[PDB]
Amino acid sequence: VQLVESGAEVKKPGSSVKVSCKASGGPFRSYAISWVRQAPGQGPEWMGGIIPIFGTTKYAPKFQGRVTITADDFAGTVYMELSSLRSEDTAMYYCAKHMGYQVRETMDVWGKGTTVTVS
Amino acid sequence: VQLVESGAEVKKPGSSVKVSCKASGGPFRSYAISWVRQAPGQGPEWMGGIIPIFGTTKYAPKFQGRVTITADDFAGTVYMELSSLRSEDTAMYYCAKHMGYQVRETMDVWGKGTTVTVS
Amino acid sequence: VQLVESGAEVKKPGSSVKVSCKASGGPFRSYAISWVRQAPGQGPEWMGGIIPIFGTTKYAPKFQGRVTITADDFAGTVYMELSSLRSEDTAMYYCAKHMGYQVRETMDVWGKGTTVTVS
Amino acid sequence: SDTICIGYHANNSTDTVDTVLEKNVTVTHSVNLLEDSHNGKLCRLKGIAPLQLGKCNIAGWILGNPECDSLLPASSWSYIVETPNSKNGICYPGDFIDYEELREQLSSVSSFERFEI
Amino acid sequence: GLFGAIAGFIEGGWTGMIDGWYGYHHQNEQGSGYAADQKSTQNAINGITNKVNSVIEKMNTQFTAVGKEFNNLEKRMENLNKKVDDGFLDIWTYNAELLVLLENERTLDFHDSNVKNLYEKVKIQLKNNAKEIGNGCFEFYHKCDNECMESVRNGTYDYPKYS
Amino acid sequence: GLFGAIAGFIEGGWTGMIDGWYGYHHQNEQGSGYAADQKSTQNAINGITNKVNSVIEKMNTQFTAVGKEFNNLEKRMENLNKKVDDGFLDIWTYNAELLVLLENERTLDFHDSNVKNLYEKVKIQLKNNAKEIGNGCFEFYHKCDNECMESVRNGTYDYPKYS
Amino acid sequence: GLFGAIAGFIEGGWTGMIDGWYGYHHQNEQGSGYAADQKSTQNAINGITNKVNSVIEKMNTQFTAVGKEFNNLEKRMENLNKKVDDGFLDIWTYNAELLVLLENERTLDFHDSNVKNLYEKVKIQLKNNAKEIGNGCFEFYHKCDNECMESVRNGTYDYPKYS
Amino acid sequence: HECNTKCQTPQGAINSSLPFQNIHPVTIGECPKYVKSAKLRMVTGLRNIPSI
Amino acid sequence: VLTQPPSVSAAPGQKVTISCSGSSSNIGNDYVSWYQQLPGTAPKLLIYDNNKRPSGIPDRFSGSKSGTSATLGITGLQTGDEANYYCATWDRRPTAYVVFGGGTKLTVL
Ligand SMILES: *[C@@H]1O[C@H](CO)[C@@H](O[C@@H]2O[C@H](CO)[C@@H](O)[C@H](O)[C@H]2NC(C)=O)[C@H](O)[C@H]1NC(C)=O
Ligand SMILES: *[C@@H]1O[C@H](CO)[C@@H](O[C@@H]2O[C@H](CO)[C@@H](O)[C@H](O)[C@H]2NC(C)=O)[C@H](O)[C@H]1NC(C)=O
Ligand SMILES: *[C@@H]1O[C@H](CO)[C@@H](O[C@@H]2O[C@H](CO)[C@@H](O)[C@H](O)[C@H]2NC(C)=O)[C@H](O)[C@H]1NC(C)=O
Ligand SMILES: *[C@@H]1O[C@H](CO)[C@@H](O[C@@H]2O[C@H](CO)[C@@H](O)[C@H](O)[C@H]2NC(C)=O)[C@H](O)[C@H]1NC(C)=O
Ligand SMILES: *[C@@H]1O[C@H](CO)[C@@H](O)[C@H](O)[C@H]1NC(C)=O
Ligand SMILES: *[C@@H]1O[C@H](CO)[C@@H](O)[C@H](O)[C@H]1NC(C)=O
């Protein structure tokens, strides 16, 4: 399975952004999908994930009022929207496989990255 | 469902008559169908009924050798034939639904009526 | 069913021969098929047989290194090849049904015969 | 202690099939229903050899083109073969009226007799 | 499978059983050994060959079919001809693929059902003079020699004689 | 069948049971008799009539369709017309035959499943106050009069009262 | 259903079990709670997504297709064009509707089979140290704490230790 | 060349009794049916789980 | 090996019996089948499973087995019973294979 994110984006504070993720294979998947954030010089940060059939979404307590994760199923894509950009939402964003249908701690396949700059 | 009988008929004694009944919906039904007779100024009278798949027919002891009840299945129609008409076979004839596949005492849907005069 | 062998053949010693057997009905069968040899003036001789789906073949200990039995399935034909012909492989060859899928001792349907002469 | 068990068959086959709920299931026995092999040559159909035109087409074969001098003795065939380099048809420029209908007519002829009218 | 016997409570096959699809493995003082069940295998073979023959029969042989020719002023008829050819090819490809895909699953469920039926047939016979172990296996309480084994693998096991 | 009840551990039908598809036969001191089960038969009849009506509905009525005429210089269009007619006839013949062949088997498995469900429903009710004989038959340990029989054939059999 | 578990001897679903399709509800001195079974749900999800992907894949994308024009002296070809278009539309409508109708029933039987398999898996583990109540429910004879409960839902329940 | 056949395509002769082929839609003789598939295998045995 | 009486002679209307004798290797642990071959045709199955008859075989033919020997009995003899009769059993020890008899010429008067 190959995961491909969208292009790199640069915005200015106070706005929102929407990144996307496309997976190879059949349109419908049997694994959960997560989004991970990594600022330059620090460790990664789990943002939130989505479940294949039940449609449940989970977010971190820090990113509870800003992030929104959705899926398309028939297209095979996953979307993440982040609102009210500060100057600290400038990092690298990864799309991560999960193995099973639940959002556990084991992500075995990662994408390549996508930089979102705020200025 | 809706039950529709044929038109009104007038004959003279010594002949036979054939009345019809058409039900709405799919051609094949899962309920039994009965025929009821009511003379002017008297209570109703049960004549006989037919069962959907097993094809069994039941008649009253009074109308044993005269009535014949048949079905068409693919057309959705039920036919009743009364032979050797007298001057007393002048009443209103009703077609009655039954609920289940057996000819019980509970008829929950009736038609509208059809007069057969003998003179 | 009907079993039909191929034509009669005449060869000279040191060569090989290939006889065939065609059965009526559907191409795929649920019974085993055997080949029987009968020299003029003696009793029959079982040569070998084949099993419908598992594809196993059995041969007599005398005809171990010479006979080869194969099938076609989609054509409905069974082939027998006999190699290194002597002057004693001059007999009548029969194709025999078996009843079940195993090569037992009960052959209930026979063909008609095919003479192979060696000279 | 006098034991008895129930079971089923297994072998060393490595042939797989596809179902609706799963792909590549290895099974003990199977058959193949599709053919994808040919010999790569044009053969004879039930004894009769085909008629190969070569440099000519139907118009050149039938009109009597000077470059189709070898097709004169032909009087029987099983099918007609043309090539993408069949360019010797009408030498004098002009129009051949109702030519595809003539090809459709000849698509159901197996022999003819050529006589001097 | 839908019946839970193959790759279920019986988790593996036998490479030592060569003459059948379903069977028994026994063990007593005389010795051990495998043995196929002939009635079940015969019925399954009949059904499977019937299915294959029906699939073969529902598709008829294709006779001669060659293309046509059109000139520069007959594009509409040429396009209609192409449309007809492509449509029929697509329909028949869909039919063949769907038929194979749907028949494979039923064939795989058939064998699971047969194995489960054999297990239940033996279990109702032994009922009380044997302990169910779990892997499709039964352990006798009394001494079961070869006559007892051959009567169990026949359907005529005599319950009262062995209490 | 896939469930092993019809022509399985219950090996024959009843010609004395005339009012239903599945039912009971009882025997006590008062007498004997057959009796159909109405809920199972009603559900089966509903399902079967639904299936037949769906099969009828998926095929639409055929309207007027007559042939055409061509002259001696229009062979290609005549052949195309023949091709279209033959192809559509073949496709619809295949569809109809396959639909009937595939629906018959499912219909035959439906009744086997229903008989097995009825047997299990009775077996879990009796559990301990009855002995399983083998042919779909239960033999009571206590005395079961007509009230007990009618409660067994209703689903409200009272286990504790009869120990 | 054909297997008699969903809307059968287990007559209702759980709105308190949110993370899975099939699962357990336990009760002891520590407390109560629901818990999904991950292996069964994972296998079912794999199968269902495989089926949906196959259905999507068997239908190919439709490319450009526009109409043609004819004059007052070309009625036969116009009628042939209409015939071809209508026939192909009818065939594909029939195919799609039949495929959906037939796949829904198998999808509904799959879950019933899975629930029955889970019930039997637990029943063969407990065998003797638990009483079958009837609603898919087992009542232990000994004292079963959280370690015992977790061992039951893992498949490694130790029969001899609890007699 | 100089051979014999019962089914001929513009690419070669066919020598089978199978019900399907994917060589060429144009045929002469008695030929199987043309499909665009690449694999059509029908199962007759059970699931293969050896070593156990 | 199965050994039978080479010839049999009797009169019309009488009852005759042919005995197939073998050994504990073949006859003692399997079944025996009977075939009748008219002069010029292929053999025909008479008795299988040691006492059974196919469809289309009269009741005049019967058979049984006794320990390590079987016997075929024909009662109601006529002229249409002129043939050779063979006994067959599926031998199985070193390498299993079908084994046929020697032959029997039932002569009718
Ligand atoms: C079933 O097996 C085939 C052959 O082993 C697999 O085909 C391979 O598929 C992968 C991607 O799915 C390709 O990268 C390979 O090139 C394919 N190999 C060949 C030889 O074509 C197929 O993927 C398997 N199916 C599944 C669902 O795993
Ligand atoms: C194996 O089971 C079969 C089926 O019942 C038995 O066949 C019976 O055999 C006896 C003689 O032993 C006959 O009298 C019966 O007529 C047979 N029944 C049928 C239905 O044909 C067979 O005997 C059993 N084998 C053994 C060794 O007991
Ligand atoms: C047969 O079973 C039905 C189903 O339980 C019984 O119906 C109940 O009847 C009692 C009165 O006898 C009512 O109070 C209940 O409300 C009924 N239940 C339902 C769900 O309707 C019926 O009584 C039983 N028959 C007998 C003779 O006991
Ligand atoms: C739940 O069941 C699994 C499967 O049997 C157990 O996995 C085993 O765990 C032990 C250590 O506890 C290992 O030594 C084995 O190799 C494991 N087996 C397999 C097949 O992986 C697991 O331990 C069980 N959980 C508990 C709490 O007992
Ligand atoms: C299985 O074993 C047999 C034994 O000879 C061998 O002939 C056959 O090729 C093997 N099958 C495979 C797929 O290797
Ligand atoms: C091919 O066809 C020829 C004759 O048409 C035939 O003799 C041969 O057996 C066939 N098969 C092979 C593999 O050559």
Burial class from Cβ neighbours inside 10 Å (0-12, 13-18, 19+) for residue B110 reads middle
- H52: which residues sit within 8 A by CB, 6+ positions away? D10, E11, E12, E13
| Distance from the Cα of residue G104 to its chain's centroid | 10
* Contact criterion met (CB below 8 Å) for C27 and C39: no
Structure tokens at F155: 């689903």
Q: Which of E38, E148, E149, E156 best tests ligand 2's pocket when mutated (most atoms within 8 Å of CB)?
A: E156
Structure tokens at D80: 């007609």
Q: Is C33 helix (H, G, I), strand (E, B) or coil?
A: strand
| Distance from the Cα of residue D20 to its chain's centroid | 35
As a 3-state breakdown, chain H gives helix, strand, coil percent values, each rounded to 5, of 0, 35, 65
Minimal Cα–Cα distance from E151 to chain C, Å? 22
Residue type, H40: L
* Contact criterion met (CB below 8 Å) for I63 and I75: no
Q: Give the residue among G87, G158, G90, G95 at the shortest CA–CA distance from G129.
A: G158
The protein residue with its alpha carbon nearest to ligand 6, atom 5, reads H5
Residue contact G53–A28, C-beta within 8 A: yes
* Contact criterion met (CB below 8 Å) for A37 and A47: yes
Residue type, A37: R
CA–centroid distance, G148 to ligand 4, in Å, is 15
Q: Give the distance between the most distant pair of CA atoms in chain H.
A: 54
| Distance from the Cα of residue G93 to its chain's centroid | 26
Helix boundaries (H) for chain G:
38-57, 75-126, 146-152
Q: What angle do CA C91, C92, C98 make, to 5 degrees?
A: 130
Q: Give the residue among G122, G109, G110 at the shortest CA–CA distance from G37.
A: G122
The protein residue with its alpha carbon nearest to ligand 5, atom 5, reads D12
What's the CA dihedral at I90, I96, I98, I102 to 10 degrees? -90
| Distance from the Cα of residue B1 to its chain's centroid | 16
Burial class from Cβ neighbours inside 10 Å (0-12, 13-18, 19+) for residue G32 reads exposed
Q: Give the residue among G25, G15, G18 at the shortest CA–CA distance from G118.
A: G25
What is the total residue count of chain F?
Answer: 163
CA–centroid distance, G154 to ligand 4, in Å, is 9
E runs forming strands in chain B: 3-5, 9-11, 17-23, 33-38, 45-50, 57-59, 68-71, 77-82, 91-96, 115-118
Minimal Cα–Cα distance from H41 to chain C, Å? 14
CA–centroid distance, C55 to ligand 5, in Å, is 13
Euclidean distance between CA atoms D76 and H1, whole angstroms: 18
List the 56-95 stretch of C: residues with Cβ below 8 A of E.
56, 74
Euclidean distance between CA atoms F107 and F49, whole angstroms: 11
Euclidean distance between CA atoms D41 and D32, whole angstroms: 25
* Contact criterion met (CB below 8 Å) for D81 and D50: yes
E runs forming strands in F22-94: 23-27, 32-36
CA–centroid distance, F116 to ligand 2, in Å, is 29
Q: Give the residue among D53, D72, G56, E109 at the shortest CA–CA distance from F106.
A: E109
Q: Which of F39, F148, F152, F156 best tests ligand 3's pocket when mutated (most atoms within 8 Å of CB)?
A: F156
User: What residues of E are in contact with residue G103 (Cβ under 8 Å)?
Assistant: none
Structure tokens at B18: 């054939």
Q: Which helix (H) or strand (E) holds F90?
A: helix F75-126
Point out the residue among E48, E63, E93 whose CB comes nearest to the CB of H36.
E93
- C51: which residues sit within 8 A by CB, 6+ positions away? C32, C57, C101, C102, C103
Helix boundaries (H) for B35-88:
none
Give me the residues paired with residue B17 across strands.
Answer: B82
* Contact criterion met (CB below 8 Å) for C28 and H44: no
Residue contact F76–D101, C-beta within 8 A: yes
As a 3-state breakdown, chain E gives helix, strand, coil percent values, each rounded to 5, of 50, 15, 35
CA–centroid distance, E106 to ligand 5, in Å, is 28
Euclidean distance between CA atoms I80 and I45, whole angstroms: 16
Sign of the dihedral through C-alpha B82, B86, B92, B98: negative
Instruction: Report whether residue F156 contacts ligand 3, using a CB cutoff of 6 Å.
Output: yes
Phi first, then psi: what are they for A96, rounded to 5°?
A: -130, 130
- I84: which residues sit within 8 A by CB, 6+ positions away? C43, I36, I37, I103, I104, I105
Minimal Cα–Cα distance from G73 to chain D, Å? 20
E runs forming strands in chain D: 3-8, 15-17, 25-27, 30-32, 34-35, 44-45, 51-52, 80-81
* Contact criterion met (CB below 8 Å) for E45 and C52: yes
* Contact criterion met (CB below 8 Å) for B76 and B27: yes
- Looking at chain C, which residue has its C-alpha nearest residue I37? C43
Which 8-state DSSP code applies to residue D72?
Answer: T
Burial class from Cβ neighbours inside 10 Å (0-12, 13-18, 19+) for residue D10 reads buried
Euclidean distance between CA atoms G34 and G149, whole angstroms: 12
Give me the residues paired with residue A100 across strands.
Answer: none
Beta-carbon count within 10 A of I18 CB? 20
Minimal Cα–Cα distance from D11 to chain E, Å? 6
Which 8-state DSSP code applies to residue D48?
Answer: B
Q: Is F47 helix (H, G, I), strand (E, B) or coil?
A: helix
Structure determination method: cryo-EM
CA–centroid distance, B69 to ligand 6, in Å, is 67
Q: Which helix (H) or strand (E) holds F152?
A: helix F146-152
Measured between CB atoms, does D29 come within 8 Å of chain C? yes
Euclidean distance between CA atoms E79 and G65, whole angstroms: 11
List the 26-65 stretch of E: residues with Cβ below 8 A of H.
48, 52, 55-56, 59, 61-65
Residue contact C54–D31, C-beta within 8 A: no
DSSP one-letter string for I5-17: -SEEEE-TT-EEE
User: What residues of B are in contact with residue F42 (Cβ under 8 Å)?
Assistant: 30, 100-101
Task: Name which of E62, E66, E95 to mutate to probe chain H: the one with the most chain H Cβ atoms within 10 A of its Cβ.
Answer: E62
Q: What subunits make at least 3 CB pairs under 8 angstroms with H?
A: C, D, E
Structure tokens at I65: 């087995």
Euclidean distance between CA atoms E50 and C25, whole angstroms: 11
Euclidean distance between CA atoms F106 and F114, whole angstroms: 13
Euclidean distance between CA atoms A47 and A58, whole angstroms: 9
**A113: left (phi > 0), else alpha (psi -120 to 50), else beta?**
left
Euclidean distance between CA atoms D82 and D51, whole angstroms: 9
Instruction: Report whether residue E156 contacts ligand 2, using a CB cutoff of 6 Å.
Output: yes
Euclidean distance between CA atoms D81 and D61, whole angstroms: 12
Could you identify the residue written with the tokens 């003379």?
A: B39
Euclidean distance between CA atoms H47 and C67, whole angstroms: 33
Euclidean distance between CA atoms I105 and I8, whole angstroms: 6
CATH class as words, domain G23-162 = alpha beta
Residue contact G53–A27, C-beta within 8 A: yes
Task: Name which of H5, H14, H33, H48 to mutate to probe chain E: the one with the most chain E Cβ atoms within 10 A of its Cβ.
Answer: H33
Burial class from Cβ neighbours inside 10 Å (0-12, 13-18, 19+) for residue A86 reads exposed
* Contact criterion met (CB below 8 Å) for E130 and E141: yes
Could you identify the residue written with the tokens 């504790």?
A: F160
Could you identify the residue written with the tokens 């349907």?
A: C109
| Distance from the Cα of residue I105 to its chain's centroid | 11
Euclidean distance between CA atoms E96 and F94, whole angstroms: 11
Side-chain half-sphere CA neighbours of E78 within 13 A: 9
- I61: which residues sit within 8 A by CB, 6+ positions away? I34, I46, I47, I53, I72, I73, I74
Euclidean distance between CA atoms F113 and F119, whole angstroms: 10
Mapping DSSP onto H, E and C, the string for chain A reads CCEEECCCEEECCCCCEEEEEEECCCCCCCCCEEEEEECCCCCEEEEEEECCCCCCEEECCCCCCCEEEEECCCCCEEEEEECCCCCCCCEEEEEECCCCCCCCCCCCCECCCCEEEEC
Euclidean distance between CA atoms E46 and C25, whole angstroms: 14
Q: Give the residue among B7, B21, B9, B11 at the shortest CA–CA distance from B75.
A: B21
Strand C9-11, strand C115-118: pairing:
parallel
- G35: which residues sit within 8 A by CB, 6+ positions away? G17, G23, G24, G25, G26, G153
Instruction: Report whether residue E154 contacts ligand 2, using a CB cutoff of 6 Å.
Output: yes
End-to-end CA, chain B: 34
Structure tokens at C108: 């209930």
Beta-carbon count within 10 A of E20 CB? 22
Q: Which of E154, E158, E161 best tests ligand 2's pocket when mutated (most atoms within 8 Å of CB)?
A: E154
Euclidean distance between CA atoms I64 and C108, whole angstroms: 19
A-E interface (Cβ pairs under 8 Å ≥ 3): no
Which 8-state DSSP code applies to residue E19?
Answer: S
Residue contact D8–E6, C-beta within 8 A: yes
Euclidean distance between CA atoms E134 and E125, whole angstroms: 17
Euclidean distance between CA atoms C6 and C20, whole angstroms: 6
To one decimal place, what's the resolution in Å? Answer: 2.6
Phi first, then psi: what are they for E6, rounded to 5°?
A: -80, 125
Euclidean distance between CA atoms G91 and E91, whole angstroms: 9
What is the total residue count of chain E?
Answer: 163
Give me the residues paired with residue C46 across strands.
Answer: C36
